[PDB]
């Protein structure tokens, strides 16, 4: 063939990666949804023209917010039809009907003009990527835990929040979640 199925494979792997991202962050999705075998993916996504349109490219992502037991607050993200927003990054959807989070995935043809307005709404951010096709055997990353009550640790160690080791905001693992200051 040609470089046709390559883009589909890239996008499918990225989609599975993002589903794993949200499930790890704490937004329940179906396990067989996260599996999404590529044959089923192309069966549901098969363009009459055989194009990345796939005749059903309406990728929608919505959260579950299961761990309200430990997180007193948890918002939502609306990632709809983010299959091919454009050839490059285009400011389109600054804010939607979500009040804590929001994810906009782009083809990494970054537009610094569109990179504005992001640090504007208090409860929002974005760190998306092209494929990001994480966890691997080469990866020695210890699984991360967001300690909602680190007050116990601070009391038992008699510390200040600064004296702990610092992981930067730009850390790719720290971007896997919406980790804050």
């Amino acid at each position: 063939d040609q470089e046709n199925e390559r883009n589909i494979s890239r996008l499918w792997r990225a989609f599975r990666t993002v589903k794993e991202m949200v499930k790890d962050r704490g937004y329940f999705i179906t396990q067989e949804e996260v599996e999404l075998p590529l044959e089923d993916f192309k069966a549901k996504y098969c363009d009459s023209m055989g194009r990345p349109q796939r005749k059903m490219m309406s990728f929608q992502a919505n959260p579950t917010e299961e761990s309200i037991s430990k997180f007193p607050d948890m918002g939502s993200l609306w990632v709809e039809f983010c299959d091919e927003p454009s050839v490059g990054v285009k400011v389109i959807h600054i804010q939607e009907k979500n009040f804590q989070t929001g994810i906009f995935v782009y083809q990494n043809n970054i537009t610094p003009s569109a990179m504005k307005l992001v640090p504007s709404i208090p409860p929002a951010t974005i760190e998306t990527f092209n494929e990001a096709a994480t966890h691997h055997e080469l990866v020695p990353k210890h699984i991360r835990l967001s300690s909602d009550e680190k007050r116990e640790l601070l009391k038992r160690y008699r510390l200040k929040e600064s004296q702990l080791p610092r992981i930067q905001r730009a850390d790719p693992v720290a971007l896997y979640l919406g980790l804050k200051r």
Binding site: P119, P122, E161, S162, R181
Partner: peptide
């Protein structure tokens, strides 16, 4: 004194917010 840098990145609908933190720090 603390890391509140990114909180006051947008206050002018600026120095008003920092008045609360200091009293909170001793609180």
């Amino acid at each position: 004194l603390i890391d509140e840098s990114y909180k006051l990145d947008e206050i002018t609908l600026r120095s008003e917010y920092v008045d609360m933190a200091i009293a909170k720090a001793l609180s």
